[PDB]
Amino acid sequence: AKTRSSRAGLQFPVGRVHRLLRKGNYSERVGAGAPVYLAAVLEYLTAEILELAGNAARDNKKTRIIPRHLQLAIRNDEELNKLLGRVTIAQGGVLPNIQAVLLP
Amino acid sequence: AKTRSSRAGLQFPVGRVHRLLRKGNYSERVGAGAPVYLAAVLEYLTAEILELAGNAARDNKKTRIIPRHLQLAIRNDEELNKLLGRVTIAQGGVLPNIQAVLLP
Amino acid sequence: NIQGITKPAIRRLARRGGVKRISGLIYEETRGVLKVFLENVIRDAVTYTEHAKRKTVTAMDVVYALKRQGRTLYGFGG
Amino acid sequence: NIQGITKPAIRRLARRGGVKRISGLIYEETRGVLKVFLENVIRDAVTYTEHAKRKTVTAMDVVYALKRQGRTLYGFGG
Amino acid sequence: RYRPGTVALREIRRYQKSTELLIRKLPFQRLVREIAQDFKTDLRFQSSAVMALQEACEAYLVGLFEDTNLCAIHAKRVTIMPKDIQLARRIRGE
Amino acid sequence: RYRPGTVALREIRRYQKSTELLIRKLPFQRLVREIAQDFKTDLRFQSSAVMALQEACEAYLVGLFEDTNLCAIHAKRVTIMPKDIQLARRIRGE
Amino acid sequence: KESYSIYVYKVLKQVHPDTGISSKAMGIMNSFVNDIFERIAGEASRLAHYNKRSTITSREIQTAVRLLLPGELAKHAVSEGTKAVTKYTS
Amino acid sequence: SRKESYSIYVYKVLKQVHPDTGISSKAMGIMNSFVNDIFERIAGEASRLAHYNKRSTITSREIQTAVRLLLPGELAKHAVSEGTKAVTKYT
DNA sequence: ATCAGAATCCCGGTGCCGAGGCCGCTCAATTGGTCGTAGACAGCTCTAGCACCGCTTAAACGCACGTACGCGCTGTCCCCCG
DNA sequence: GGGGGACAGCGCGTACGTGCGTTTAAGCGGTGCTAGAGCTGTCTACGACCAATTGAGCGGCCTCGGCACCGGGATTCTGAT
């Protein structure tokens, strides 16, 4: 027996994603490739954010990712910021940004 | 044959609303009262807009409602303007509004 | 083709917006803003067309594109 | 209870927002717009609670209320 | 000669009362086609599709000019400038 | 004696480079309870519900203060005033 | 095609017996009904799944209309819906 | 009462991209919220596409189109590559 | 004021062309019986929210005080309005 | 082409940043209680479905009288005087 995640070479759960599509009732039927495609996309997005968040953790000399690192990774990337525009990351804080007219 | 619409004393179609709920991928099952309630609420909203639009038509010396009259009815009342905030009426135009500082 | 959006047309749009005086640099700025808006809506409308395997962008494709960008349009079939 | 939102707290929020100099009338204005925001979120959160026939507002009720007002919050179960 | 501002206010009063489209149709159609060419070649367009695009764009520009105007007034000016358009869009999230 | 503005800018750098909640928890909790009383009586609250409200409110106010600041700078001022808050909210659609 | 044109006209005669409506205005009304129908049904759907229910009741519709519609429009819409369900059950 | 989450899969992907980096429970909650949110957005758009084309089945084509409509710029380009590769390997 | 003269209201006409009145009919909503299963509801339980209490201590507070930024006033020059 | 709004300079002076030790109460940890969320069981009463139908809804067709826009006359705009 080979799990559908292992058959697609993915770490994300294809079987669970399939069930969650079927029991959203989002449609009457769900194709066999739809959960595989969706799982791969979710995995890709998580990898991107985690990669960028781990870099932010290393640049603050930390070995564990915290919400601050996730906020730094998302707001410092034009595409991730645009995707997560109407999102609030709890305990994420803000980018350091001061308007030039206010400076010394 | 007493139509569910006539049983509920409504002009809006309960049977059609029921079918649209059942085929619209909203839930596995739909209660018997849900289409009746939805049809009524929906008809109430149409009556409210049409009454206000007909008044605007009579004020503008017309016997036919046009998109302008609908825009006038919606935009000049708070709750209807809030409900349809992120909406554009085609050929509705805008409310006559000039900032006081621009006046001679 | 962007120059087809003439200064008088932009002035008319500003007049409906209640604008009394307009700087000379507004016309080029408006053309740029309109181009971005159109590109964004047309991109999505064409995506819907390609998904339907059609070669003709329909009013419905435009309506759907506007709806998903939070600019719902009434009067064109939804 | 609205006075519990003290001037120092409103200055701290403004400092995170990058504001250097604050007028004395801003504190009362901020208290107002905070009250409106809270009322709108709490109203919807309580509606969800009543629909669940519960007597306790849950974090999920708040998350749902924020989501439907276009202020999605991550970190409370999202 | 009418003083500067008199005819401008008369035009505001005329266009705020009307609902007609203010951009010429054929130039707008040409712009829509040329922008769509970059996404897909040999694209046809329903007449109503172009009209839907025109209605939405005009409503977008009119709404933006309103917000731009209000920013000019905030700077105590009666003239709209690019900085006003930029502020309005930034605050709107665009 | 630090000149007016020096300590203000030091506070901006302190609070922008940190993530903690800036409103005292107990007073905020009292406000939440007091507001909810008008919608239904004898309401209980999970502690996580109040904290989720806190986080959202602080994020909303910080975001509004950012736009309010831009309005002030637009009017050639470095001081935020109620008219700046009003403009930001109006343009945002609030 | 299917439209709500006939029903919008029936209600127009009830509110304004001597008032007609243009085809463009009718299209706006059709778009309006479809839009609000979808908002309510979508909220009722999320509200069912959030409570782990499989069934869309009048209760879900009422709550959706109690979250979507603003101020007194919700108050009157709820009255209309409740009256209709009561009349239908009898 | 068991409450399912994507924590185990977040951890797996983290160990691939940054083997020596861990994650806090708060940060894990953010990631879980993120996956659930994106999953809803894509599935909801795919649902609309199917009904808009009178279809009763959500297939990989609907997911791909939804990914084009929601993900901005190059995030869409790479996400589509990942999804296509996974479907090919699975078949 | 003071009158000249366009801009705009307002009145009678008109025909014409979309809205509504009207016919034919068909298919989707209706009526009624049967199944099943979801959820409406009773009891348990033990979890979490709540009220209450001690102490503390860090934070809010009033005002005295300096000061510099907000805005009133004047003058210009040339950009847009017409 | 002109003229009136945008920009610059400035007085100025009053609105508010900073301290400081004062006046306030946040908050953190402990102590009990119990409203009530949630689980378990049931019974079952309402919905899905299957089969006949029929009567509104919708495609088509006409006539009409509401209204776009034509010519005239008026009044109150506004600018020269």
Numbering used by the authors:
A (entry chain g), B (entry chain c): 14 to 117
C (entry chain f), D (entry chain b): 25 to 102
E (entry chain e), F (entry chain a): 40 to 133
G (entry chain d): 34 to 123
H (entry chain h): 32 to 122
Give the exact sentences the study uses for this entry.
RNA polymerase II (RNAPII) is a central transcription enzyme that exists as multiple forms with or without accessory factors, and transcribes the genomic DNA packaged in chromatin. RNAPII consists of twelve subunits, which are highly conserved from yeast to humans. To understand how RNAPII functions in the human genome, we isolate transcribing RNAPII complexes from human nuclei by chromatin immunopurification, and determine the cryo-electron microscopy structures of RNAPII elongation complexes (ECs) associated with genomic DNA in distinct forms, without or with the elongation factors SPT4/5, ELOF1, and SPT6. We successfully visualized four structures of the RNAPII ECs with DNA or nucleosomes existing in human nuclei: (i) EC transcribing genomic DNA, (ii) EC transcribing genomic DNA with SPT4/5, ELOF1, and SPT6, (iii) EC paused in the downstream nucleosome, and (iv) EC with the upstream (reassembled) nucleosome.
We next determined the structure of an EC associated with a downstream nucleosome. In this complex, EC paused in the downstream nucleosome, at approximately 20 base pairs (the SHL(−5) position) from the entry DNA site. Elongation factors, such as SPT4/5, ELOF1, and SPT6, were not detected in this EC. The nucleosomal DNA region is peeled by EC until the DNA position is bound to the H2A L2-loop, in which the H2A Arg77 residue may capture the DNA backbone. Consequently, approximately 20 base pairs of the nucleosomal DNA (the SHL(-7)-SHL(-6) DNA region) are detached from the histone surface. In addition, the nucleosomal SHL( + 0.5)-SHL( + 2) DNA region directly contacts the RPB2 lobe and RPB1 clamphead. These histone H2A-DNA and EC-nucleosomal DNA interactions may be responsible for the EC pausing at the SHL(−5) position. In the EC-downstream nucleosome complex reported here, there is no space for ELOF1 binding on the EC-nucleosome interface, due to the direct contact of EC with the nucleosomal DNA. Interestingly, previous genome-wide studies have consistently revealed that EC is predominantly paused around the nucleosomal SHL(−5) position in cells. The existence of this complex suggests that the SHL(-5) pausing may commonly occur in a DNA sequence-independent manner during chromatin transcription. Despite such heterogeneity, the structure of the EC-nucleosome complex is clear. This fact indicates that the EC pausing at the SHL(-5) position of the nucleosome is not a DNA sequence-specific event, but instead may be a common feature in chromatin transcription.
